[PDB]
Structure formats: C-alpha cells, structure tokens
C-alpha cells in the first residue's frame, strides 16, 4: 500500500508497531541514524513514524512531510517533553499518559492526534513504568492507525505549559531505574530542594546577642567560681574592648587570636572580637608550643588577646593586648556601629592534624547563627536554663556551649579544667547549681550516665560512636553528627530506645543530606554511600589552602549545589533518620567486594552475652585480605552459631571467616579499644 520509514534508536526492530504495519502490506524501512534530505531513502516514502528517535530531522525534511510525520511519545504532552519522559512523569509528579502527535520544528510541540491517560502503581519499578508506557502507546497506535492513514482525525493543539527535559538531565538519578515509584518519591522528599524555602539569614551573632541584652539586661549571663557578669555587664565590657580593637585596625574577616583559660575574660574576649568586626582564633594554652606557634603562624592574626600568665607562649609572635591591662579597654560602653555581613568570618578552629597537618577551618556568622537559631527551639531553651562551658576553647563544641545558650538568654557556667576530669565532683556541681542542658563529648557523656544526676533536662553528645545508653538521670539523651567544616553538627537524634547502631538523626534547619555513590549520583533509600552535606551549615573552607578547599567543598557536576564531601559512609533509614556506617577510606577488598570492616561490630555486640567487639582485616601477603572477628564474651562461642547469628542480618560475603575470643580487650588510655595492640592470626 505505502512505504513507511520507521525511525528509532532505542526500541527493537521487532516492535509490535513494525509488524502490524507489515501485516497491512506496508514496506517498513528502519533507520537508527540521523538522515539528510539528500538521501534517496526519502523517495517512495508515504509516512515517517518515529518512536524513541534520538536525533532531529533537518527542517528541510519536516517541511516535505508536513502532515505525514508521526511520532510516539510515551508522555501526556505537553507534560514531559523531550528525553526520559516516563521518569520525569513520576519524579515531577506530572499527569501520566502517552501521546501520538505530529512532528514540528521544535521538540514535541506539534499538534496531537490521539491521547490516552495511563496509571502507574506505587509498587511498580521505573523499569515497569517504562515498559508499560511503551506497551500502551504501541497498542494505541495499532487501534487508531487506520484513523491516522485516512487522516480523519482532527489534530488539536497542545494545552499550554508542560515541562521539558534534556538527555543529560537524568545523569544524577541513574541508580534509580530499578527503584519503586513509592521508594522514588520518598527519595525526592528527603533530598530534593524544597520548593518553599526558609528565609535566608541576614544577621550576625553579635547583632542577635545585642538584641538579647536589651531584653534581659540584668540577667546573669556567665558564672565563673563566685564571680558573674550580666548580659549588660558582659556587653558593656566587651564593647569597651571591641572599641580598642577596631581602633587598632581590626576590620571584617581579620583574624584575632585569643589565648586564655576558661574564665570570664575569655567570654568578654570572644564577643569583643566579633563586635570589632573580625573572627577569633582560639588557642588552648595547654597545647605544645610547637602547635601554638603553628596556629599563630598559619592564622593571619596580627593581634593576640591573652594573659600575663600565657603571654610568653607566643614568643613575641604578634601584637599583644593584655585583658588585665585597664588601658586595653575603652571609655565607650556603647555598641559599635555594625560593619559586618553574615558571610564574614566569626571564628577559625583547627582540625586534629593526626593524619596530615592541622587545617584552619573558616566558619562564617551565618553558619553559627543558623545553628544557634535551630538549637533554641529544637531543645526548648529558655532563660531559666543553665549550661556548662565544658568543651575546650578551640573545639566547635565550645561554640555550642557559649553561643547557642547566650542567644536563648540562658546562663553559662564556666567549668574549670580542674573540675573537668573528676566527673563525680562535676555532677555535684551540676546538682547544686541546677544545670539543665549541656553538651558532653561521648565517653565523657557515657561516664556521666553512671552518676546519679537530677539537675539535667537534656544532655547532648556526639562526635564519636555512641555505645551506652543506660543512665541514672531523668534527662533526655540526644546524639548528633557533623564535621567542624560544617559548623558543630548538622543532624540530631533523640535516643528513645536502645539500638545496635544508634542513628545520627535527621538534618537541622536549612540543611540537606545526600547519600551519593562514587560517581556522585543519588543512592536509593537504604543503600549505603558517601554522606554529603548541603545548606547553611557549610563554612568557607580551609585557611590558605584553597585547592584543598575546592576538593572537599565541591560544585556538584549535575546539580550545581555547593556540597561538603564528608568522607564518611552512611545511609538513610525508612523513617528518615540517618545511620552512620564508618569512614570511607577504611574500605578494603574482600573477595571482589568493597567492604567497611567495623560495620559488623554492631551485630556481634547485639548478641546478648557479647559485650565488646572489633572486626579487622589482615593480609596473607598474597594480595588477599580476610576478615577476623574479635569479641569479648564469657566463654568461646561456636563458629557455626556466630556465622548463623550474623547471617540473619548480613550477606554471606560480609560474615568474617575467623572469630577470636578474648576475655578482655587492651583498652588504650582513652578507654577505647586499641585496634593494633590485639594479637594477630595467620592462615
């Protein structure tokens, strides 16, 4: 009857459409590559049918077959024009359907011939939807085809609007072809940028602090031994010092080093630096002078705020201002004119430096403000609260102690490093003064659970792997996670019940967390990946290490968002909470499978009688490694039972081949388990 040209690049040559036309005595030419107007294949062509065609036809060809070029697009046009239509139908939650239409000069904008709605089940995979839409449009083509040939159908224009997507738009969602419609949308909720956005931050910390002083000026803000300062007193004195600092040339983003012990002068010093305009650089005086001289060198601090006692530890490195010299304080008690922006620096804190050299982490005001603004309502902090200034001067945990509670109008209690280690005398101090909320490093926290405490209402911990929950006190227990690079913490979890692996919770305000794979593509919920952080938590980066900064604070290839590569390994749970799964460079090759040893420790320890476990990886010198299971228990446990115990919750390739019983572990000075001090096993 007529010779038809079938254009497609994805579909098989033996699609139902191809055979139905052959059944009607039509010659079907198949062509899966771009074609030009010169090609003689055009001659003796009565109809051009395209179906999943991956090229465009020259405008010279569309003008010669006007009214004779037909295309099958498994979408309910104008929705989901372009590439990967079925997918974007599910992701963007558009109307579902399939359309047979005329081609035109643009992408799937031509007039419609026949249109039919389709439905996708919440349990269908995306592959299922792809195949059902193909199955539906094919059958629709067959039904109305004769109505196409004789052209009796009246073409109608597309509804206004619709969406469009391009070829590469799907690169980010590549790992989801086999995921479910329900599971997919769930991933969209947890990771997609919210359409409705929380207002950005337009305030510096000292702005908000100065507001709090006007509201509760005579409230005690900080207590050290018997001495105390009110919000007004603290504000006026910090103002006096801040004037002297700006007169000495302090300008925004300038660094000012502070070297003091926990005291009132420390709090005055911190606020004075902010108010002047700059960011403060805490230097614990009990550091090796080697580190002190390095922190002072890497930091551009021309000024040093410090004590007569600790003055010399600088070795005349920088200009010194004595917080005990009455001439370092100005006559002016008024707040200074604000010169800062929220993206100016507020503080610079240095990393451990155990692996590599110590990096100076730059944190901006808006980072700190966002956390303190999330902290106040989340934990219901009120002026009636009292918090410990416990963590060290130069750890972001101190930023929590001081700043969160100051903007809530609460009362800070200085902890002398003298009373810091004797947690028993510390508990006595807490119950006496009525301490209600505070952050304690893990272990320091786990120890405090042994003490009978009645004062606390909330204790917050994190930074290490929490493993003990039972506690004497009547207070809620919270566990959170986050690198210093992203301002204190970016997630929090309320420890309601015991867990083999205690989750790290859900993100805080203006923060999103993405579990991505090695290609930086999305992982379905429940699938482990690298934890990426997004939003207002991300600091500026490392000081004087720009290349290194751009390695960790990336511009995502597909998304374009700024994100922090944590190097950590985690996954989302069904209820939305996040679960930490160890570091990423701790991975090793085990029978052709990438595995994190230590991901097994929770399951072992979950067994009733086992109390402490650490699984390691040892090489046989044959380029092959094997897993060894170390566990403390009353007595030996048969290899057949443990292999079966883990088998319930773990694959077979993860189950360790060797198990080692020991009545105890060589705990290091820290109190944790020394991984290397354990015995080795050959095989």
From Swiss-Prot:
Q: Which domain of life is it from?
A: Bacteria
List the residue ranges of the region (GART). 3-145
Miscellaneous information on this protein: Linear gramicidin is a pentadecapeptide antibiotic produced during sporulation.
Q: What does the similarity note say?
A: Belongs to the ATP-dependent AMP-binding enzyme family.
Role this protein plays? Activates valine (or leucine, but much less frequently), and then glycine and catalyzes the formation of the peptide bond in the first step of peptide synthesis. This enzyme may also play a role in N-formylation of the first amino acid residue in the synthesized dipeptide.
Domain remark text: Two module-bearing peptide synthase with a C-terminal epimerization domain, which is probably inactive. Each module incorporates one amino acid into the peptide product and can be further subdivided into domains responsible for substrate adenylation, thiolation, condensation (not for the initiation module), and epimerization (optional). At the N-terminus, contains a N-formyltransferase domain that is probably responsible for the formylation of the first incorporated amino acid.
Q: How does it assemble?
A: Large multienzyme complex composed of 4 subunits; LgrA, LgrB, LgrC and LgrD.
Q: What is the protein name for this chain?
A: Linear gramicidin synthase subunit A
The source organism is Brevibacillus parabrevis
């Amino acid at each position: 009857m007529g010779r038809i040209l079938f254009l497609t690049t994805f579909m098989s040559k033996g699609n139902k459409v191809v055979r139905y036309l052959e059944s009607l005595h039509h010659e079907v030419v198949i062509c899966q590559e771009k074609v030009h107007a010169q090609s003689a294949n055009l001659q003796e062509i009565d109809w051009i049918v395209s179906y999943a065609y991956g090229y465009i036809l020259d405008k010279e060809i569309v003008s010669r077959f006007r009214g004779r070029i037909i295309n099958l697009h498994p979408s309910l046009l104008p929705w989901n024009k372009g590439r990967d239509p079925v997918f974007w139908s599910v992701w963007d939650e558009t109307p579902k359907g399939v359309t047979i239409h005329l081609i035109d000069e643009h992408v799937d904008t031509g007039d419609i011939l026949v249109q039919e709605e389709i439905a996708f089940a919440d349990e269908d995979t995306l592959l299922d939807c792809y195949n059902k839409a193909n199955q539906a449009i094919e059958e629709l083509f067959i039904r109305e085809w004769e109505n196409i040939v004789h052209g009796r159908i009246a073409p109608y224009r597309q509804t206004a609007g619709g969406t469009l997507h391009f070829k590469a738009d799907r690169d980010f969602y590549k790992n989801l072809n086999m995921t479910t419609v329900r599971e997919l949308l769930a991933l969209k909720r947890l990771c997609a940028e919210p359409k409705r956005g929380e207002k950005p931050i337009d305030k510096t910390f000292h702005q908000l602090f100065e507001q709090q002083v006007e509201m509760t000026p005579d409230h005690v803000a900080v207590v050290d031994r018997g001495q105390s300062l009110t919000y007004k007193q603290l504000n006026e004195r910090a103002n006096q010092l801040a004037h002297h600092l700006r007169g000495k040339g302090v300008k925004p983003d300038d660094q000012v080093a502070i070297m003091l012990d926990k005291s009132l002068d420390m709090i005055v010093s911190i606020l004075a630096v902010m108010k002047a305009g700059g960011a403060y650089v805490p230097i614990d005086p009990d550091y090796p002078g080697e580190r002190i001289a390095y922190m002072l060198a890497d930091s551009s601090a021309a000024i040093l705020l410090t004590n007569a006692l600790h003055e010399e530890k600088a070795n005349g490195a920088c200009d010194i201002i004595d917080v005990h010299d009455p001439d370092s304080y100005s006559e002016n008690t008024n707040n200074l004119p604000h010169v800062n922006r929220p993206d100016d620096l507020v503080y610079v804190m240095y990393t451990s430096g155990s692996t590599g050299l110590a990096k100076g982490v730059m944190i901006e005001h808006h980072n700190l403000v966002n956390f303190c603004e999330w902290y106040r309502p989340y934990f219901g902090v009120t002026p009636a609260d009292k918090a410990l200034v416990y963590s060290s001067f130069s750890f972001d945990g101190s930023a929590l102690d001081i700043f969160t509670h100051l903007l809530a109008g609460a009362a800070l209690h200085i902890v002398p490093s003298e009373r810091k280690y004797d947690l028993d005398a510390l508990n006595d101090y807490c119950n006496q003064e009525g301490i209600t909320i505070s952050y304690l490093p893990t272990g320091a926290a786990e120890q405090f659970m042994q003490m009978d405490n009645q004062s606390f209402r909330v204790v917050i911990t994190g930074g290490d792997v929490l493993k003990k929950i039972e506690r004497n006190g009547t207070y809620k227990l919270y566990n959170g996670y986050g690198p210093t690079e992203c301002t204190i913490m970016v997630t929090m979890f309320e420890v309601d019940k015991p867990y083999a692996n205690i989750p790290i919770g859900k993100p805080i305000d203006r923060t999103r967390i993405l579990i991505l794979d090695e290609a930086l593509a999305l992982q379905p919920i429940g699938v482990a990946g690298e934890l990426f952080i997004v939003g207002e938590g991300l600091g500026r980066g490392y000081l004087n290490r720009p290349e290194l900064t751009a390695e960790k604070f990336i511009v995502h290839p597909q998304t374009g968002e700024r994100m922090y590569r944590t190097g950590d390994r985690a996954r989302f749970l069904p209820d939305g909470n996040i679960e930490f799964l160890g570091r990423l460079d701790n991975l090793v090759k085990i029978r052709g499978y990438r595995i994190e040893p230590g991901e097994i420790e929770p399951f072992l320890m979950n067994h009733p009688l086992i109390e402490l476990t650490t699984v390691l990886a040892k090489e046989q010198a044959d380029g092959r490694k094997y897993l060894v299971g170390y566990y403390v228990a009353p007595e030996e446990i048969p290899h057949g039972e443990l292999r079966e115990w883990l088998g319930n919750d773990l694959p077979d390739y993860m189950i360790p081949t060797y198990f080692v019983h020991m009545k105890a572990f060589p705990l290091t000075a820290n109190g944790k388990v020394d991984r290397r001090a354990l015995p080795d096993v050959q095989a």
